[PDB]
PDB file of C-alpha atoms in Angstrom:
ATOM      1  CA  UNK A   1      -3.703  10.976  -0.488  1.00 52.35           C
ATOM      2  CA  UNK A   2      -6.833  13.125  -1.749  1.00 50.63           C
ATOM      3  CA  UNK A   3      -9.429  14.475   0.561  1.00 52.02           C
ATOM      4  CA  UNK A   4      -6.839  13.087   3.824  1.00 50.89           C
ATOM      5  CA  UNK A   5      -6.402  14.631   7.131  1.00 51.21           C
ATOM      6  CA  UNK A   6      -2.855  14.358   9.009  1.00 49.53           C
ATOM      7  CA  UNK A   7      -1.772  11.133  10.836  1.00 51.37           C
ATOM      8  CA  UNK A   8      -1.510  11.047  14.244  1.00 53.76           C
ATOM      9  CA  UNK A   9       1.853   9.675  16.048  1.00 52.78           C
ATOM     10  CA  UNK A  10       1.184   5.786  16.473  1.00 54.28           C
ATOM     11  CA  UNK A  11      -1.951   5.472  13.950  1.00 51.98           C
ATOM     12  CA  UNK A  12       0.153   3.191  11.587  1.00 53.17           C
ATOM     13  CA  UNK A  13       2.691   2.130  13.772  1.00 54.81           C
ATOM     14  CA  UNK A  14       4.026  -0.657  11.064  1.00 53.81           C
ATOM     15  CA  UNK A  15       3.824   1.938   7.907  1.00 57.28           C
ATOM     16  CA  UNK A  16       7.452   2.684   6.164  1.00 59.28           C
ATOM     17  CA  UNK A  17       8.051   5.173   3.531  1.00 60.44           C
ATOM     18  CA  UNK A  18      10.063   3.635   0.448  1.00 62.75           C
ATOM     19  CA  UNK A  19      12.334   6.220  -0.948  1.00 61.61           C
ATOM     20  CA  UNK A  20      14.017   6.076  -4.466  1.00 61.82           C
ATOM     21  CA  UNK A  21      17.174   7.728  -5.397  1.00 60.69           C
ATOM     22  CA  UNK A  22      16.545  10.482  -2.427  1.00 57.61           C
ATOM     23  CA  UNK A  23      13.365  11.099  -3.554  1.00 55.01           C
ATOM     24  CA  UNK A  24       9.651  10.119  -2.903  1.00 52.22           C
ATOM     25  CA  UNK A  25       8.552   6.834  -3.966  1.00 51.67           C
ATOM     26  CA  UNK A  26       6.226   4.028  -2.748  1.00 50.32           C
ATOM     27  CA  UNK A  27       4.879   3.291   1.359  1.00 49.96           C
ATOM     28  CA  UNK A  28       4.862  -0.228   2.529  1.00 51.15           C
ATOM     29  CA  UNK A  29       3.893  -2.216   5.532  1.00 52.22           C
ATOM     30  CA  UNK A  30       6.642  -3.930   7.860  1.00 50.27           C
ATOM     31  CA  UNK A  31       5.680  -7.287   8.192  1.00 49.09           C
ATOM     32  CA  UNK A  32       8.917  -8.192  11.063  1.00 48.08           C
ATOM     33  CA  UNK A  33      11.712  -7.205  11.842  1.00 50.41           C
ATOM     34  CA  UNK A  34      13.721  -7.271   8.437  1.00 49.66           C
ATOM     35  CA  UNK A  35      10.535  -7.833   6.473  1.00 50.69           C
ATOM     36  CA  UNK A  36       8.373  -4.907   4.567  1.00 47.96           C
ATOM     37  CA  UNK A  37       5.576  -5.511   2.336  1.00 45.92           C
ATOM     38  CA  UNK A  38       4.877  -3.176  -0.741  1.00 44.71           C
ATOM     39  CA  UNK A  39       3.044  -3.180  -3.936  1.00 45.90           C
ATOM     40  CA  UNK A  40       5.243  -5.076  -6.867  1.00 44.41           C
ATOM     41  CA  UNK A  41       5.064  -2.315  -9.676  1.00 45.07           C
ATOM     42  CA  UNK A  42       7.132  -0.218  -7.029  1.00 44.56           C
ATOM     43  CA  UNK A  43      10.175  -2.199  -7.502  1.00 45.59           C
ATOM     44  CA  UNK A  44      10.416  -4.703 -10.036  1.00 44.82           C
ATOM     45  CA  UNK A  45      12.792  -5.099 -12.135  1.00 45.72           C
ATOM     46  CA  UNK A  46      14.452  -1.738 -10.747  1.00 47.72           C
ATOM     47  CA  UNK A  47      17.930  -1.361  -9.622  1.00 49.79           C
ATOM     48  CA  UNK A  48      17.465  -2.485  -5.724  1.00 47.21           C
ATOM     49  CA  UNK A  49      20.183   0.124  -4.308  1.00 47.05           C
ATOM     50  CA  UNK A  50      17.906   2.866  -5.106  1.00 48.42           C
ATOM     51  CA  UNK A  51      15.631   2.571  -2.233  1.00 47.08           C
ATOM     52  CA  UNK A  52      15.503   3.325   1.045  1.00 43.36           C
ATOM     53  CA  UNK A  53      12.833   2.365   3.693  1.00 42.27           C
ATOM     54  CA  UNK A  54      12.241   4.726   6.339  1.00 40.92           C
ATOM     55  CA  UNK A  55      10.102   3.314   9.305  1.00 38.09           C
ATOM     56  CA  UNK A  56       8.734   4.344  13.030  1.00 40.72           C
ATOM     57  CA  UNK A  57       8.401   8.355  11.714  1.00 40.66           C
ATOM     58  CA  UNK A  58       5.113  10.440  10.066  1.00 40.31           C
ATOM     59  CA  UNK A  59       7.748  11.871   7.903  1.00 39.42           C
ATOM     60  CA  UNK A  60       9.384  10.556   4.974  1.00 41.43           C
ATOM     61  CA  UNK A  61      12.283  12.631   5.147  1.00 39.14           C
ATOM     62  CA  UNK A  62      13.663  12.413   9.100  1.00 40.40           C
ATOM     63  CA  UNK A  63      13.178  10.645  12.319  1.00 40.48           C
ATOM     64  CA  UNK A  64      12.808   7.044  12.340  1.00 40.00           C
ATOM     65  CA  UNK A  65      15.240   3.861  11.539  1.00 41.30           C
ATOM     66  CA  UNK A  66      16.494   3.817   8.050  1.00 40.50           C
ATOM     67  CA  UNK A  67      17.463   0.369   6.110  1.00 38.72           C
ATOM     68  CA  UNK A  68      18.714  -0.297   2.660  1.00 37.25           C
ATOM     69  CA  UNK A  69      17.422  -3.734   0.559  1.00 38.58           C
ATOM     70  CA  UNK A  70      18.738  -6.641   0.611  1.00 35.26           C
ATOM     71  CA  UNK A  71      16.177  -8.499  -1.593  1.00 35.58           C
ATOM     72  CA  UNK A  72      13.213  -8.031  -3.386  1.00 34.25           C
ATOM     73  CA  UNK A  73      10.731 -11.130  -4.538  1.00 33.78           C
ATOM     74  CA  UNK A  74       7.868 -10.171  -6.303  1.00 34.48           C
ATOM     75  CA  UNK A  75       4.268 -12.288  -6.193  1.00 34.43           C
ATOM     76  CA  UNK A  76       5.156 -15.073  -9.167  1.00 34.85           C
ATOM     77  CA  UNK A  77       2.477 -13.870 -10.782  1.00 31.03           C
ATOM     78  CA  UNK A  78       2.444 -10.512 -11.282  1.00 30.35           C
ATOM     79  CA  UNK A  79       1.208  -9.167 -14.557  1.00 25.89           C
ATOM     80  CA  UNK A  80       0.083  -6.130 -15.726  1.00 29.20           C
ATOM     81  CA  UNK A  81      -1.940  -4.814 -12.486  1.00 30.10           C
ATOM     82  CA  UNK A  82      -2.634  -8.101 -11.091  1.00 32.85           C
ATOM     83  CA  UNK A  83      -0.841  -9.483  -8.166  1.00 30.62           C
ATOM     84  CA  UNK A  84       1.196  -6.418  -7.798  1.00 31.74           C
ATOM     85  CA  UNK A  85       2.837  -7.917  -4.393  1.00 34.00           C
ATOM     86  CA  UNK A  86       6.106  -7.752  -3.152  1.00 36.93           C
ATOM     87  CA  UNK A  87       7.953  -8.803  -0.665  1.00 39.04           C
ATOM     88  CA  UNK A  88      11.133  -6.498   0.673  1.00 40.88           C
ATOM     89  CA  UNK A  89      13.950  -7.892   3.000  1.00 44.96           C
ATOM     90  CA  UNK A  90      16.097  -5.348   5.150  1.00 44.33           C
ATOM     91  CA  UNK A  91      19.510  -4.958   5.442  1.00 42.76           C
ATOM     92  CA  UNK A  92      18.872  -3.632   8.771  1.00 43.97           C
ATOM     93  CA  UNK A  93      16.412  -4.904  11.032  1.00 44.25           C
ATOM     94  CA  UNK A  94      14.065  -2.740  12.885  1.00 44.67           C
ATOM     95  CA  UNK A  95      12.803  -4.021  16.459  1.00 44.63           C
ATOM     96  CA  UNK A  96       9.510  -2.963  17.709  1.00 46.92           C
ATOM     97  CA  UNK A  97       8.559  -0.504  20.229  1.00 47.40           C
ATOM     98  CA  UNK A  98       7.765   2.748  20.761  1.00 45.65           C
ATOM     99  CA  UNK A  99       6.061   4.137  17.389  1.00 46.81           C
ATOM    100  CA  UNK A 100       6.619   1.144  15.570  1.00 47.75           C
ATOM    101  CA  UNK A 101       5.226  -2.196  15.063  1.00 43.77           C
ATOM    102  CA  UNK A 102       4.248  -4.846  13.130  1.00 42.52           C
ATOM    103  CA  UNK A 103       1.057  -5.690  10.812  1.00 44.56           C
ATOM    104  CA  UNK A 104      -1.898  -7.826  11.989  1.00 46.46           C
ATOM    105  CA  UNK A 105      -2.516  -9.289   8.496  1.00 43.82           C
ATOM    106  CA  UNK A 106      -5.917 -10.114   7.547  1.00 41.76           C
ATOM    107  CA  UNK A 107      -6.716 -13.504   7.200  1.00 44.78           C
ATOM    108  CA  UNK A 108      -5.868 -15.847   4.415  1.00 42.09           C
ATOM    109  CA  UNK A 109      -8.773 -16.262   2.384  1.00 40.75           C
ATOM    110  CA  UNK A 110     -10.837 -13.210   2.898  1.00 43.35           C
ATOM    111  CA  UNK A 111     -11.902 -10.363   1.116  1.00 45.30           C
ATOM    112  CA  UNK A 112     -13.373  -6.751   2.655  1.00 45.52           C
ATOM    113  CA  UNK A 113     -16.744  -6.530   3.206  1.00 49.72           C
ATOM    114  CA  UNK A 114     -18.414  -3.906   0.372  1.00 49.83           C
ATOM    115  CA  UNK A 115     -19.985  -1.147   2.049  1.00 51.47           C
ATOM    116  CA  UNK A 116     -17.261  -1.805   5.276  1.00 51.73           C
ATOM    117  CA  UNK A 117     -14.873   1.699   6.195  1.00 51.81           C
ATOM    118  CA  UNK A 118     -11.336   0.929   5.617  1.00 52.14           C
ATOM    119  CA  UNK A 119      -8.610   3.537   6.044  1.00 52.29           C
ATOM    120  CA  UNK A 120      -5.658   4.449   3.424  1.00 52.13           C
ATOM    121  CA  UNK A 121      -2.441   6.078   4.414  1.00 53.06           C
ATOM    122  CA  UNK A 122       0.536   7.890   2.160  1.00 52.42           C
ATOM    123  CA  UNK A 123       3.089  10.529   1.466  1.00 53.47           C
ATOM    124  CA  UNK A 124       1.636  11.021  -1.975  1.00 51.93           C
ATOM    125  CA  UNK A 125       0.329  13.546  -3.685  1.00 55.37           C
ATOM    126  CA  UNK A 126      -2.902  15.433  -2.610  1.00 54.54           C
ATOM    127  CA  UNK A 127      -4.415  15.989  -5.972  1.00 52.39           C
ATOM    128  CA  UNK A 128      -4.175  14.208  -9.462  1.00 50.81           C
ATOM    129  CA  UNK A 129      -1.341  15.147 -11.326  1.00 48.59           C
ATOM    130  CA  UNK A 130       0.690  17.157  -8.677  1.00 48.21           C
ATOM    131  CA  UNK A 131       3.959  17.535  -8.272  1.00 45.32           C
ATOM    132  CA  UNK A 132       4.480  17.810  -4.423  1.00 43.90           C
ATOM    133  CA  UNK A 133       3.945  15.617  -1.854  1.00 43.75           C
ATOM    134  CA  UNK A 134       3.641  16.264   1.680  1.00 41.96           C
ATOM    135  CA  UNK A 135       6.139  15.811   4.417  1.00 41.35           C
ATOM    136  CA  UNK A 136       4.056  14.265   6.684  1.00 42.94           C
ATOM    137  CA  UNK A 137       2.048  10.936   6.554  1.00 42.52           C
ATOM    138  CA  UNK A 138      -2.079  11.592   5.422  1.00 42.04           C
ATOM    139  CA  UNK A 139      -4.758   9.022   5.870  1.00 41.06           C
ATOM    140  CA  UNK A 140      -8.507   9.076   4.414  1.00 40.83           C
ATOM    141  CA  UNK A 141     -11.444   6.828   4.861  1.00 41.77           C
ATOM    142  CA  UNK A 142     -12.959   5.177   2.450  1.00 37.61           C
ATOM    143  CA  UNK A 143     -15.852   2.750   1.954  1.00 38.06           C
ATOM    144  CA  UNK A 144     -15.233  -0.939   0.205  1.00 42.52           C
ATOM    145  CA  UNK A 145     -16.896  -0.983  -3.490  1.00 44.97           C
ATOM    146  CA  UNK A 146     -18.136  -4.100  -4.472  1.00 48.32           C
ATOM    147  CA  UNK A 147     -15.666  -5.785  -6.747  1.00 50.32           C
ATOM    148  CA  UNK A 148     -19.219  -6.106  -9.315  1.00 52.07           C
ATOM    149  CA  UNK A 149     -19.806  -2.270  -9.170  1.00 54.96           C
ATOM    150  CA  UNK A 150     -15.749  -2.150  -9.528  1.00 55.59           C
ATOM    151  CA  UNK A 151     -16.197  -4.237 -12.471  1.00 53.98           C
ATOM    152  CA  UNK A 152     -18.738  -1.880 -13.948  1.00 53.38           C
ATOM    153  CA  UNK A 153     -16.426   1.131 -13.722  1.00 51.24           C
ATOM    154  CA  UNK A 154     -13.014  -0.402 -15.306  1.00 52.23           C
ATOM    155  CA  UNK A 155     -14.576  -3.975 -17.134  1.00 53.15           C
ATOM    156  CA  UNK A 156     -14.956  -7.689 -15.783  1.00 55.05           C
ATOM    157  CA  UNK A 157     -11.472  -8.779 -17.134  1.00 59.40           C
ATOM    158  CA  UNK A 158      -9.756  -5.546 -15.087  1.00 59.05           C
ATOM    159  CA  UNK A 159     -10.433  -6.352 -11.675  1.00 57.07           C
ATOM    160  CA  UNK A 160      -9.356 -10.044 -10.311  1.00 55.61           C
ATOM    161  CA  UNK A 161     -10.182 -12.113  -7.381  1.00 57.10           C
ATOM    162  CA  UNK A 162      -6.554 -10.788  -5.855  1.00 57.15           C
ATOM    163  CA  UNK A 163      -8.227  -6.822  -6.366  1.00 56.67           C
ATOM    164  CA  UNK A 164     -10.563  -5.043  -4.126  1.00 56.57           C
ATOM    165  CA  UNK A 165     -12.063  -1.469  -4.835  1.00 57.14           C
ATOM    166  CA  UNK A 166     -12.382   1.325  -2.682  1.00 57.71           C
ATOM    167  CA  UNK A 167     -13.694   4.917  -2.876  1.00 58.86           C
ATOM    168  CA  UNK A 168     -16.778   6.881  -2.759  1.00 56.65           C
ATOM    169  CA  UNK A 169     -19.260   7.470  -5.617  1.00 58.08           C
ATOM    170  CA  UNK A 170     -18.590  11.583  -5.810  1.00 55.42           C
ATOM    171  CA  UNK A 171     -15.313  10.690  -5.674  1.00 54.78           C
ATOM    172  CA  UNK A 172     -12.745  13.442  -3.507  1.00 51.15           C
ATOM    173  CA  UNK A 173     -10.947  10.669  -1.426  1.00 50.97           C
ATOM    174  CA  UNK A 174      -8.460   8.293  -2.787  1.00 46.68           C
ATOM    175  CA  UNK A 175      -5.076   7.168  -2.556  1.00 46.04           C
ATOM    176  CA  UNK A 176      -2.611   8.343  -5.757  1.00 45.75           C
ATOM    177  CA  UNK A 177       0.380   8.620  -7.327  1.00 42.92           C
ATOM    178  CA  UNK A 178       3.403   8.067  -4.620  1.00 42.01           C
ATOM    179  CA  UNK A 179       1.170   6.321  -2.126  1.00 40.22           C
ATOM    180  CA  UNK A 180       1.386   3.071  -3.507  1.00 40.28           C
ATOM    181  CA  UNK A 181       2.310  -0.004  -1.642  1.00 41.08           C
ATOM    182  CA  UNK A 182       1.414   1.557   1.356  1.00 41.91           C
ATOM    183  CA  UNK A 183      -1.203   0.264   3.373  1.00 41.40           C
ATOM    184  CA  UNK A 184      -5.142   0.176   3.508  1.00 42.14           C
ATOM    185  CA  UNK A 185      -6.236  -0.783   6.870  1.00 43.78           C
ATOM    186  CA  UNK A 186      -9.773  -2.343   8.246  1.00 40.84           C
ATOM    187  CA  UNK A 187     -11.538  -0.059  10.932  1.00 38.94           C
ATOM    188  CA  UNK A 188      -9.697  -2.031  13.439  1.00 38.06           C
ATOM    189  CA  UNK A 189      -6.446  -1.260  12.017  1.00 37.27           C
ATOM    190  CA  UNK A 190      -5.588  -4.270  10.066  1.00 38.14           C
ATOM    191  CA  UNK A 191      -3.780  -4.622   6.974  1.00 41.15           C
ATOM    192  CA  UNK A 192      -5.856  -6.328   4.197  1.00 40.01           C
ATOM    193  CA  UNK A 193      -4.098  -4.382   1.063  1.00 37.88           C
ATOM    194  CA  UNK A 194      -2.013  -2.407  -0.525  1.00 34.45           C
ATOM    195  CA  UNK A 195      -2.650   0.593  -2.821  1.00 32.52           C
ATOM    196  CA  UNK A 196      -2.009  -0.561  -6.350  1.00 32.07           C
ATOM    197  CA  UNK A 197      -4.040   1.852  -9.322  1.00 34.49           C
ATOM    198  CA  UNK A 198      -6.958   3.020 -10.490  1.00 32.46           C
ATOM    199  CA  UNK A 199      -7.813   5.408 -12.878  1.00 31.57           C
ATOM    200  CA  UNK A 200      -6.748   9.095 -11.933  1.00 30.91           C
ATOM    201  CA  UNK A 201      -7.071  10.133  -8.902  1.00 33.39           C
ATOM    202  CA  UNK A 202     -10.148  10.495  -6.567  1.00 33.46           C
ATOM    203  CA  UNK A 203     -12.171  10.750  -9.372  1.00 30.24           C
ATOM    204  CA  UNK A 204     -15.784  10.097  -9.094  1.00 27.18           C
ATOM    205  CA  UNK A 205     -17.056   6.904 -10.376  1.00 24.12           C
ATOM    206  CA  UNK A 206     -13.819   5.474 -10.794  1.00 24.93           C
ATOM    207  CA  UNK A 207     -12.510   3.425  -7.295  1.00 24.60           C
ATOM    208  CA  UNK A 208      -9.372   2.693  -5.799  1.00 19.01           C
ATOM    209  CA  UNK A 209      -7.783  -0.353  -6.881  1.00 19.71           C
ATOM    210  CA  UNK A 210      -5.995  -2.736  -4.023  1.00 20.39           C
ATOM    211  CA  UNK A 211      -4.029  -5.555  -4.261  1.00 18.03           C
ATOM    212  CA  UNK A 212      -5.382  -7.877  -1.503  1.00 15.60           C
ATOM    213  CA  UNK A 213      -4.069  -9.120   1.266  1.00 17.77           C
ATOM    214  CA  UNK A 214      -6.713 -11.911   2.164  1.00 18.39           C
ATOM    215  CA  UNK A 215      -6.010 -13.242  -1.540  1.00 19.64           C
ATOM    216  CA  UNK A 216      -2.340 -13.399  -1.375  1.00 18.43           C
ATOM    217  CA  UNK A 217      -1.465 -14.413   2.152  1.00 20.35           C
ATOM    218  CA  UNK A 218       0.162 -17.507   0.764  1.00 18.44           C
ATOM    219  CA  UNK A 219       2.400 -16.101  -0.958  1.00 17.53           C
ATOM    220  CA  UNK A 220       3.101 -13.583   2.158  1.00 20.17           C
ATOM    221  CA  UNK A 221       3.532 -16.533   4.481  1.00 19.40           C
ATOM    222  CA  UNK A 222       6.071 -18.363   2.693  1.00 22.54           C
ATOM    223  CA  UNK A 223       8.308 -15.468   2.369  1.00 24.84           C
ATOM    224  CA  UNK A 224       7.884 -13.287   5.797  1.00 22.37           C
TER     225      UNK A 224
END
């Protein structure tokens, strides 16, 4: 996260941190109890042992219930950037209560409002290109970009119907590298994406790219 501020204790109570052979990786969203959702492009095709899912913690590293995979199914149609969607099951299930719970999902059909404040959280880096990434959980807000002014900044065929953009024009707030799959929240705390790519980092002119939520609740629903 670019331009974030720290977490507080209980402001994402469903977020897990996805770790890959020990090191930083990908967030995602639990779902249920043995249930996480993530973007696709942080686990397909890779060897599924690698990860770990950390959840009910602001750090990636300690505190919290731990869980290994048990399988991964990625949207059907994933391709390139588009539908990047998956769906995690957990070796371990994690009940709720306390710091952690589950996502409100946004519902199936909708898409964010442009112009509407919606609120990104990650253990990524804090600047394009950098090597470390904090301990503890960041979140920024963000405003929705109109998937037309989106279209503008990366071309009509880039950005699908299953995409949203978010970001400000002067750019110095985004989501990047190591925060994807982890959630982007409405200003009442649901979860209506995940943080898929864009085009550096917090860059001006050049939006956050989300995989949405609203667009791909069927295939959420089937496999929850």
């Amino acid at each position: 996260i670019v331009g974030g501020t720290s977490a507080s204790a209980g402001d994402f109570p469903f977020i897990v941190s996805i770790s890959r052979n020990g090191g930083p990786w990908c967030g995602g969203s639990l779902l249920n109890a043995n249930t996480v959702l993530t973007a696709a492009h942080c686990v397909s095709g890779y060897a599924q042992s690698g990860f770990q899912i950390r959840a009910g913690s602001l750090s990636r590293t300690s505190g919290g219930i731990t869980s290994s995979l048990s399988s991964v199914r990625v949207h059907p149609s994933y391709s390139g950037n588009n539908n990047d969607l998956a769906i995690l099951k957990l070796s371990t299930s994690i009940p709720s209560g306390g710091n952690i719970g589950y996502a409100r999902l946004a519902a199936s059909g909708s898409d964010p409002v442009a112009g509407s404040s919606a609120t990104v959280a990650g253990w990524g880096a804090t600047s394009e290109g950098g090597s470390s990434t904090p301990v503890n959980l960041l979140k920024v807000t963000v405003p929705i970009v109109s998937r037309a002014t989106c279209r503008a900044q990366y071309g009509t065929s880039a950005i699908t119907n299953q995409m949203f953009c978010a970001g400000v024009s002067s750019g110095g707030k985004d989501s990047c590298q190591g925060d994807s799959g982890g959630p982007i929240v409405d200003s009442s705390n649901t979860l209506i994406g995940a943080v898929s790519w864009g085009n550096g980092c917090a860059r001006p002119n050049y939006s956050g790219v989300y995989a949405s939520v609203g667009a791909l609740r069927s295939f959420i629903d089937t496999y929850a």
